[PDB]
Write a protein that binds this ligand. Sequence first.
Ligand code: PLP
Ligand code: PLP
Lengths: 432, 432
Amino acid sequence: ASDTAEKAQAIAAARNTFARDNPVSAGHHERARRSMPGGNTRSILFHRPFPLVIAQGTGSRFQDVDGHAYVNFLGEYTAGLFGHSHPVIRAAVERALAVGLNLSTQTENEALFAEAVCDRFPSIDLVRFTNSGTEANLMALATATAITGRKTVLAFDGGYHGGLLNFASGHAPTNAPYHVVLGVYNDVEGTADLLKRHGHDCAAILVEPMLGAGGCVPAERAFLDLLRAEASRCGALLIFDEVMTSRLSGGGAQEMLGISADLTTLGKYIGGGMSFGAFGGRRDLMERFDPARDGAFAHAGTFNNNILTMSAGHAALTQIYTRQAASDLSASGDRFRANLNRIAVENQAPLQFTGLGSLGTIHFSRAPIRSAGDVRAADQQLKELFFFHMLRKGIYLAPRGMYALSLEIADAGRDAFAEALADFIGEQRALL
Amino acid sequence: ASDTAEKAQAIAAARNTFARDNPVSAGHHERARRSMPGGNTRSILFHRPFPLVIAQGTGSRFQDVDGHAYVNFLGEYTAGLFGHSHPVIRAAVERALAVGLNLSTQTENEALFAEAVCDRFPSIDLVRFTNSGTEANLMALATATAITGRKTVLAFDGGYHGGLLNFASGHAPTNAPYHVVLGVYNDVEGTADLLKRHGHDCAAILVEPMLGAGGCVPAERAFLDLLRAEASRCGALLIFDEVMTSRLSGGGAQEMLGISADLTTLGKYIGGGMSFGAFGGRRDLMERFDPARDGAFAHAGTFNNNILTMSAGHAALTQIYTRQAASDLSASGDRFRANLNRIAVENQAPLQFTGLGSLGTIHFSRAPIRSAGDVRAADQQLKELFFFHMLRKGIYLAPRGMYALSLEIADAGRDAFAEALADFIGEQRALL
Ligand SMILES: *Cc1c(COP(=O)(O)O)cnc(C)c1O
Ligand SMILES: *Cc1c(COP(=O)(O)O)cnc(C)c1O
């Protein structure tokens, strides 16, 4: 996928149309720049020429400050599973307020939520709550390094484990300075080599069962089988980062695969749209945090047990996104992704959607997408054009071309997405 | 302060009375142990024989599951500034729900909140939001290490900077493996020596202007003057962890001191009781996160800009805890602490309360409390007895003897606290 002047000119024109369409968002951006770096507090939300500012949303719909309406296919990078105004989440928030905020003590609600997590995730015997997936993964590494007394962590290029463990572009100088060795996702022979070299000092292997932010790239069974066998052989803890993949069945990727990680990290939708993360796993590892134990590890955090997350999360798992709901949404998402790919094939379009269940990302290539290198080698210019095209069609998804279907997406939204994809292929024929 | 058998017997009896008083909390604990390590998800909430479970609370009051009522002097370790059911916070939550949850985009609300932070904190030119003080301090270290290209961080024994940077008991194997050198809090000559040895590779000095969790121990001006002069001299970033101290005036400890840190971390009450943290500081440091810049640092995080925190936090700073409110509460807290100390002096009690403004901790010693070593050397057995005594009197504060006055504490609560302290001194005369 080589950059062309024609594609760059098309991007320039699309950015210009977006800018002309959205002068109020542009004004907001100039003001926001005065208080936050680049008017930004979450890097992924920025895109050129400037990001949209949204005024309000209900269900699957939102409206920008210029008055334009969209269907939200982004769904908060998988956290926004309930849409913008779910009545059961609202009711949980109301119940939480009636219990009381900042009670400075435990409530029964945290235990009920923990039970709901333990009931449905087959390798989580005990769990602790954090305030983000970033904290969950940090605590999983804290656990593995403290238990094993080892320092080396095996992770994968393209892997994303939060703001301090971001390997989406390889090593980053802002990452917490764990001794991380990066392998290639899905590369069996290369990873086997790394584990022979490093296994002796390996505290943990940290891996998503599908690269999420890194392109909705499913792990192959052979790759995960290697990690499970070698973690056990060398005495490293296998950590499955299921922050995104947990939604894929009642029991996440582990239920689907019949493979158990030693620790599992969770985040995003499970707190019902409230701040949330969790790390859990084997009883004998997690019991090291029992505060009554001699030599207990400490896991602090002011908002860990906050009543809003405990209430909304329990509702999310037991009242809304039940195990059957997870199966249904994943089957719905599979049919959706298949339809998009069918549209590509029918039109001889050099593009595909990868992913699992209700999660997907477009890639402008028909080569196998198996690692971060494959994702990067696909056409990035067409990817940007696709984002702006979908916006003009009233469809909002990630700038990077990822959707994550919420429970509020229905036939009308799915049809509109499919139609807009067909229109993109037609209108951009010269560039494809 | 030496352990005696008499004091241990008194602790045994107090624990037994607590247990007899609270069989329903005891039942909850046994069940909670099945899903969370030690039935716990936040280490500080555990105490022997078991912790209370709270059923509900409004204002400054709460009720445990056995039906006992208390005045909450803990105030969520300073986060619970608004009490359990503040109507202005409720209204902000309602407004947030009307805007919409998980909108997957920026709203104007994040910019308004950032402006409110920048307006009142005199050294914060630009700010970014995180989901906890733990994340804020981690991002401050990420910033300092990435900008300077250096690895060494100077922090202080007794210092607490979140779940991955906990030095309350010195080094901990679960802390993120930053190269941290620990000094003695308030030790000018010792710290000067460390900075001569380490200043060349010092990325940052990380310090609370008052040890919070570590005993409400004010920093002396000479100590902070050393840190500011030496950070500037060697090119390390001075980071003031104001997660607790920010409440002490309109502009936190920095306004009071007339000393500016290079970066400031914030947390706890500023998000209005919602999940919250922030790091901010000098424009030229923070602009490194402008996503439009060549070589921009990334700062991710799903819930950074969540509408509940943006709304409630803006309300917290502009509608409730204004700069004048901060001055008034700190003066109120000073009068309160002075009254407690007066009661000690009047009764020849070998105890004191240290702190600033509306924050205080009891120490069973009349020696100067200037460092973590002083805190640890004070009588820990009387400290535990004090906690149980206050509970029996319907007064709830931290097991470690810390209070953090909320805006809902009034004359009745303050009088009851003072009375219960006098009663403790009288009833425990044999042990004092
Ligand atoms: C979003 C995400 C995280 C981080 O969670 P925040 O709550 O820190 O965004 C970690 N891992 C994966 C796989 C994620 O997708
Ligand atoms: C509570 C606290 C933190 C951590 O904040 P969480 O939101 O991570 O509890 C960090 N620093 C200080 C000084 C604190 O008091």
